[PDB]
Design a protein around this ligand. Structure first.
Ligand SMILES: CC[C@H](CC[C@@H](C)[C@H]1CC[C@H]2[C@@H]3CC=C4C[C@@H](O)CC[C@]4(C)[C@H]3CC[C@]12C)C(C)C
Ligand SMILES: CC[C@H](CC[C@@H](C)[C@H]1CC[C@H]2[C@@H]3CC=C4C[C@@H](O)CC[C@]4(C)[C@H]3CC[C@]12C)C(C)C
Lengths: 118, 262, 55, 48, 93, 39, 36, 617, 157
């Protein structure tokens, strides 16, 4: 659900994480490169076991694997990580490696046909 | 270049000799324990040799059989310890036909140094000639001046025809050329432009006349320079190559004798 | 489409920017395929209705 | 792109040196610059 | 670098069993993975110091599979008969 | 290969990068969630 | 190695001394031998 | 990170001057008051040292003498560690690429202080580096496969993609494989199961030096003729330990240490008894260390001192001895004595085997327990265990161990480093390769494969040389099949290189290139005579002294004349071969390249053309 | 069975040197697996100096020529600086000699090398003949049609 994706303190998520003064926490960061637009801000993602989720159905075409859409996505999201900056001599997590608001990291899981025991 | 490369590159060209039913080579005995092997590029030479054998030995002349092998395994056995098979004076040599060696020596002395002796086996090549594949332009090597120049005449005809129709292409381009030059040489008021544009016409047609001079002088130029060499030397050079001569030798290969004719 | 190399030199060597733009706008081409091939697609129509009686 | 990128580092530099005025002295012309270079790309990663 | 070994198992070798180093979250575990057709996995596996193991892959394929398939087809009848025999004779003999 | 090659060959996407265009319909709401912390 | 030739009936010399008389003349200065 | 360097300070004092401090007196240790004398105090006269020694500032040198004499136990340890890390900090340094001085103590602490960098190094995670270019911090395409990194998880060895192992300086090509059998296998009994092998041994030897020494004497002949005479046999016997030859023998089965230990004692006893005095070279150069430069080695200077190191090396060996043969060694087989005392000391060192391998009855204190080279039971040695042996020139022995298996966690061990033991060195070399070796097959194979690189090449051919006799490289071109129909014989090409044999045109082009040759070499000779007149007619203000320096000036003035002649000849070479064309340069390259000796810098007239080919550079 | 290979090697080597000398004389007259491994128990420079300490080289040969010819920020990760530090420390300890047992900090690289190396240098085009427009209940269709149309009309303004 869009409000259960990021850790924004929207008053539609169940109050899982709260302060002493009972105000939910939020993790926004105003994107110094592109301000003035809240949807391009950075924020942490919520643990998967705390999301409310739709479970949609989809038929894949008969040429899904040999078209390379999932491979393109996997490669795009897994080819970015930490870096060392020698100009400023330090480790750095770049901005293009962080999740904007409402974005999550994909987990692909395949089932085993032999695990059925009909 | 390793020996496997030359064993693969020399295979198409064969050579004839004679063996026994025991698959043994025949040799010629001499003085103080000497023998020698032979390899005749035309089997009639070995046939005449054993016809001479029949002159003095009928047994050996019935005991003959005519073998034809490429230079592959004879070059292999050259690249071996000859005393492993038994050697105390067995010197394998080649025996080219006198026709092509005579053509070779007339090539030799139509250059300026007249002699009547030859080294090796005569190989022929032509300047500009190179057989192009779907990927690269390899150099064909001809033991036969007839086959060499039969390929060379086809290549010469096709190239000089390409040149004649090239000059017809420039004839098209230049009929268009004089069109613009003529379209204002006397069509408008004269002065600056008449001088400039008929100097342009002089430019264009003196250049195109020297051009056609070049085009047909190419045919009036002689036969592209034919060269002759020794097979002994070209092989021992092919074997001991590394570096620039590597890429040089790596695209030369030898055609079969009397293959281009029929 | 096959372009003449002059168009390539025009888009390449010209240090200008809109010079390259006008070069790429004024470039021409030729298509040898118009001299060797003419392709047509057809469907072999049917002679039986998908719900008729002879079906 | 030149003006946009320069103004981006400018804005983040204003923000930082206004957040902590103590190192806003010229003594840090290589220090606050070292922080701007680290902050224009992402977040500084602690080893742990 | 938190896995030590992977072993490609199965009659078609698409599942791998993965051994997790002590440097992993949760200590040592044995974890099974079904993999997609990803032509980039083998390089990622070797160039990080992983011990890869493969089966014997039994080249024949329609001679390796015949008797086991006969068993897959005949054994359910034996299971059903044994279950019913147990209940209906091993009690009320 | 392709078409329009001559025209084929004629900002901060290298840092933050792309802007996601599937979720503008929530922008407004987020703004409100910033203007009233007590919510 | 190499062999010298002289187109005269052409004579030949090996580094015994074959003579290609236009037939042949296997001079010595008897082809009763075989491989072993 | 690194790069904590220092300045150009005088620490290495060129020992000829330090003996002035060796015969010094009235010195001291300390530092006086700064309020009176300036910082940098090594000066102490009579008056001021007297006053401060009555004051409490500085003690005298023989003061420190009897203080160290009296210092016992804990503060002895204190000042020990003090002066130790002090001298490690300000006296012994290494060098960076910039040539500065990083010391011993700071480097020690930098290495074994940060455990976080050790944790980084232990794992594999490779992290791209942001571009120092400021705009986007885009990581560069550096990446890297690093075939040493691609090889972990493997068991036997590390595949290396050739050139990578060459740039790693692994200059020990494998020479021979043999096997120590408890009982060699029989063809007749069933399947040869009777074969029980003790160890699986391999040998290696330095290939550059194998080309350097043995390639200059036994190179250039018939290989069979070179190996056929026993002079080469005594050569490979006595010059073995000079090459730093290595023997790597691995465990093939279960081995209890007592068993194989008694086996080794009985094995090296007979080689200890039956051998004569050793044949050793003469040490031409002292090779002192330069503590302040603790990673600098002089052999590049030794080969490139004046660019004419032949003459200086000759006048240097003039002191020690003149070599006994072609390669450059002045042999000296030691006399009657020094031939049994060393053998007695070797027998003693072997007498320590049952004691050092098996000290006492408790394995808990045995040196083998507690690590995977042997079992946890303390009495068996594991299969895959490897022993490396190396022999320095001057009787020194190096010995290491390595438990095999997963390359990612292989454990290497250094056992001991004894020196001067020429007897055991000779015993090992003449036992592995001697007249009666443990297996003459590997001896023969190793001698022949030590012959093969003396021609210049290297077994395990790490140069992709297409004329390598054992492992040749092929060319990517495909053998073209000339077609029968005349349709691909284009002739539309303008040029292709001339590759005929001896013909009517190539003799001519070679003779005109020879005309250019004589013009060029005559220009070179007259330029050398010009440089002669230049060096002669100039008034060099030189006091006649230091005859070695004057001989060096002679040699390198001749060298300068030769170099000016070389430049002149190269100029007229470009002139002529520009005038005639590229066919001349191609055939000249061919003849010069073949004319160069396969096993030398410049060797087996041809000298002129190959020197001028060096002017082609 | 290494000697078979090395017999072929001796064949090739003798033929190579013989043909090289032959063509040298020729053109001068015209003018006028057993062994695939590598190790390094000691740095090459160190033992090279230690050995050359006894040898007078009259001239430098090909292999040493290559070595001295190869003698003369993309690697600025702290791991690489630690690497070079351990490198120099282990070299120093290697040539410092000249539990009672030491194990190294690095491993010795026993290396294999590859042999038989080379020179250093959509959519688909299906189409029907004639579309079958669905010609050959409907009141509800027309009803919903015009109803949605007039709903849109009233919702325009
Ligand atoms: C015939 C032996 C052959 C391999 C050669 C090995 C066993 C020899 C070569 C160098 C020797 C050591 C030199 C100094 C040490 C240290 C001292 O504490 C005690 C003696 C000891 C071990 C020496 C004795 C054992 C060492 C290793 C095998 C393959 C048959
Ligand atoms: C690989 C053969 C092996 C026998 C062990 C051999 C290699 C011997 C020769 C060198 C010795 C070391 C030299 C002297 C030191 C110092 C001394 O105080 C304590 C013992 C210790 C470590 C010695 C420990 C044992 C060493 C390695 C087995 C497999 C037959």
């Amino acid at each position: 659900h869009p409000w259960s994706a990021s850790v924004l303190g929207h008053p539609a998520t169940h109050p899982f994480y709260e302060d002493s003064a009972h105000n939910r926490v939020s993790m926004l960061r105003p994107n110094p490169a592109a301000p003035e637009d809240v949807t391009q801000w950075f924020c942490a993602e919520m643990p998967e076991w705390d999301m409310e989720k739709y479970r949609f159905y989809v038929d894949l075409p008969g040429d899904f694997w040999e078209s390379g859409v999932l491979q393109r996505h996997l490669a795009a999201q897994r080819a970015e990580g930490a870096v060392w900056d020698p100009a400023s001599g330090q480790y750095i997590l770049p901005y293009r490696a962080q999740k904007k608001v409402f974005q999550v990291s994909t987990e692909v899981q395949l089932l085993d046909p032999q695990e059925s025991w009909d | 270049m390793a020996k496997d490369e030359v064993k693969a590159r020399l295979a198409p060209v064969p050579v004839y000799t004679v063996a026994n039913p025991k698959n043994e080579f025949v040799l010629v005995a001499g003085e103080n324990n000497t023998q020698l092997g032979f390899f005749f590029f035309r089997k009639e030479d070995a046939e005449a040799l054993i016809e001479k054998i029949r002159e003095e030995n009928p047994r050996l002349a019935r005991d003959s059989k005519i073998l034809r092998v490429p230079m592959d395994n004879v070059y292999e056995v050259f690249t071996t310890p000859r005393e492993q098979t038994g050697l105390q004076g067995i010197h394998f040599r080649f025996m080219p036909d006198m026709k092509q060696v005579a053509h070779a020596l007339q090539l030799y002395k139509d250059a300026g140094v007249p002699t009547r002796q030859f080294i090796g086996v005569p190989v022929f090549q032509a300047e500009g000639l190179t057989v192009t594949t779907r990927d690269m332009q390899y150099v064909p090597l001809f033991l036969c001046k007839e086959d060499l120049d039969i390929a060379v005449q086809s290549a010469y005809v096709q190239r000089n025809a390409a040149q004649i129709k090239l000059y017809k292409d420039k004839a098209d381009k230049y009929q268009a050329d004089y069109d613009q030059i003529a379209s204002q040489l006397e069509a408008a008021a004269n002065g600056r432009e008449r001088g400039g544009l008929e100097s342009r016409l002089a430019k264009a047609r003196v250049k195109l006349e020297a051009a056609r001079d070049k085009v047909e002088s190419v045919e009036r130029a002689p036969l592209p320079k034919v060269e002759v060499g020794s097979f002994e030397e070209v092989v021992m050079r092919m074997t001991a190559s590394a570096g620039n001569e590597l890429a040089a030798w790596s695209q030369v290969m030898f055609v079969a004798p009397e293959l281009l004719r029929d | 489409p096959r372009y003449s190399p002059e168009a390539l030199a025009a888009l390449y060597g010209s240090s200008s920017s809109k010079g390259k733009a006008a070069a790429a706008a004024a470039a021409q081409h030729d298509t040898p395929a118009l001299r060797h091939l003419d392709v047509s697609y057809h469907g072999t129509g049917s002679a039986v209705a998908p719900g008729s009686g002879t079906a | 792109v030149e003006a946009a990128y320069s103004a981006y580092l400018r804005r983040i530099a204003e923000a930082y040196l206004a957040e902590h005025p103590q190192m806003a002295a010229p003594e840090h012309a290589a220090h606050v610059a070292r922080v701007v270079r680290s902050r224009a790309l992402g977040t500084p990663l602690s080893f742990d | 670098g938190h896995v030590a070994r992977v072993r490609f198992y199965g009659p078609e070798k698409n599942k791998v069993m993965a051994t997790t180093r002590a440097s992993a979250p949760g200590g040592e575990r044995l974890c099974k993975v079904v993999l997609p057709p990803d032509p980039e996995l083998l390089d990622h596996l070797v160039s990080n110091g992983v011990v890869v193991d493969t089966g014997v892959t039994e080249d024949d394929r329609l001679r390796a599979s015949l008797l086991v398939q006969m068993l897959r087809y005949t054994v359910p009848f034996m299971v059903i008969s044994g279950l019913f025999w147990m209940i209906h004779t091993w009690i009320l003999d | 290969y392709g078409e329009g090659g001559l025209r084929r060959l004629l900002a901060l996407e290298a840092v933050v990068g792309k802007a996601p265009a599937t979720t503008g319909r929530y922008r407004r709401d987020l703004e409100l969630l910033l203007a009233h912390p007590e919510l | 190695x190499x062999x010298x030739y002289x187109x005269x009936x052409x004579x030949x010399x090996x580094x015994x001394x074959x003579x290609x008389x236009x037939x042949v003349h296997v001079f010595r200065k008897x082809x009763x031998x075989x491989x072993x | 990170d690194l790069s904590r360097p220092a300045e150009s300070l005088p620490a290495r004092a060129d020992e000829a001057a330090v003996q002035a401090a060796l015969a010094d007196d009235g010195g001291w240790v300390g530092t006086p008051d700064p309020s009176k004398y300036a910082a940098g105090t090594t000066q102490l006269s009579a008056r001021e040292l007297q006053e401060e020694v009555a004051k409490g500032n500085v003690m005298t040198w023989k003061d420190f003498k009897q203080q160290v004499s009296g210092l016992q136990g804990p503060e002895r340890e204190a000042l020990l560690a003090l002066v130790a890390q002090r001298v490690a900090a300000e006296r012994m340094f290494f060098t960076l690429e910039d040539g500065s001085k990083v010391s011993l103590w700071d480097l020690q602490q930098y290495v074994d202080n940060n455990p976080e960098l050790a944790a980084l190094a232990a794992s594999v995670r490779r992290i791209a580096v942001a571009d120092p270019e400021d705009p986007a911090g885009r990581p560069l395409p550096g990446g890297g496969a690093s075939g040493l990194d691609r090889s972990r998880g493997l068991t036997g060895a590390a595949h290396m993609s050739g050139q990578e192992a060459e740039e790693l300086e692994l200059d020990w090509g494998q020479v021979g494989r043999g096997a120590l059998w408890r009982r060699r296998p029989t063809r007749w009994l069933l399947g040869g199961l009777d074969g029980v092998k003790d160890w699986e041994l391999e040998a290696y030897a330095h290939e550059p030096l194998a080309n350097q020494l043995l390639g200059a004497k036994y190179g250039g002949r018939d290989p069979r003729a070179v190996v056929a005479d026993p002079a080469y046999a005594a050569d490979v016997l006595r010059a073995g330990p000079l090459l730093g030859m290595t023997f790597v023998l691995r465990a093939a089965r279960d081995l209890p240490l007592q068993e194989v230990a008694s086996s080794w004692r009985g094995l090296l006893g007979n080689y200890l008894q039956r051998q004569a005095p050793l044949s050793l070279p003469k040490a031409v150069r002292p090779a002192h260390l330069d503590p302040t430069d603790l990673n600098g080695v002089a052999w590049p200077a030794l080969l490139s001192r004046p660019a004419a190191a032949a003459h200086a090396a000759a006048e240097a060996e003039a002191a020690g001895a003149v070599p006994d043969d072609e390669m450059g060694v002045a042999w000296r087989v030691q006399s009657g004595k020094e031939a049994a005392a060393s053998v007695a000391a070797a027998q003693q060192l072997l007498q320590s085997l049952p004691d050092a391998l098996c000290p006492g009855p408790s394995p808990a204190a045995w040196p083998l327990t507690g690590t995977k080279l042997v079992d946890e039971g303390g009495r068996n040695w594991r299969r895959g265990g490897s022993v490396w042996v190396t022999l320095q020139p001057e009787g020194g022995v190096l010995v290491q161990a390595q438990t095999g298996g997963v390359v990612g966690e292989q454990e290497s061990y250094l056992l001991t480093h004894v020196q001067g033991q020429e007897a055991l060195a000779g015993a090992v070399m003449s036992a592995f390769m001697g007249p009666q070796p443990l297996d003459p097959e590997l001896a023969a194979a190793a001698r022949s494969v030590l012959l093969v690189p003396a021609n210049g090449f290297t077994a395990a051919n790490k140069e992709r040389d297409p004329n390598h006799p054992l492992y040749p490289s092929f060319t990517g071109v495909r053998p073209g099949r000339a077609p029968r129909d005349v349709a691909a014989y284009t002739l539309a090409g303008g040029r292709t290189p001339l590759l005929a044999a001896g013909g009517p045109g190539e003799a001519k082009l070679a003779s005109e290139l020879r005309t250019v040759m004589e013009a060029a070499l005559a220009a070179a000779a007259r330029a050398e005579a010009e440089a002669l007149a230049d060096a002669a007619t100039s008034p060099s203000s030189t006091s006649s002294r230091a005859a070695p320096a004057a001989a060096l000036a002679e040699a390198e003035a001749a060298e300068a004349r030769r170099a000016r002649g070389r430049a002149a000849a190269a100029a007229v070479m470009a002139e002529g071969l520009r005038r005639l064309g590229p066919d001349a340069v191609a055939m000249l390259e061919r003849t010069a390249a073949e004319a160069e000796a396969p096993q030398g810098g410049g060797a087996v007239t041809s000298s002129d053309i190959f020197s001028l080919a060096r002017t082609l550079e | 069975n290494d000697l078979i290979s090395i017999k072929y090697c001796f064949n090739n080597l003798y033929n190579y040197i013989s043909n090289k000398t032959a063509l040298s004389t020729k053109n001068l007259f015209l003018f006028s697996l057993p062994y695939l491994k590598a190790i390094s128990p000691l740095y090459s420079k160190f033992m090279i100096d230690h050995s050359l300490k006894f040898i007078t080289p009259k001239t430098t040969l090909k292999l040493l020529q290559h070595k001295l010819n190869k003698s003369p920020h993309s690697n600025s990760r702290p791991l690489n600086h630690y690497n070079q530090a351990l490198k120099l420390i282990n070299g120093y300890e290697q040539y410092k000699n000249n539990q009672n047992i030491t194990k190294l900090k690095l491993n010795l690289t026993k290396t294999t090398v590859p042999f038989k190396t080379l020179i250093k240098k959509n959519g688909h085009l299906s189409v029907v003949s004639n579309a079958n427009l669905l010609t050959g209940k409907r009141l509800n269709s027309y009803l919903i049609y015009v109803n949605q149309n007039l709903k849109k009309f009233i919702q325009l303004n």
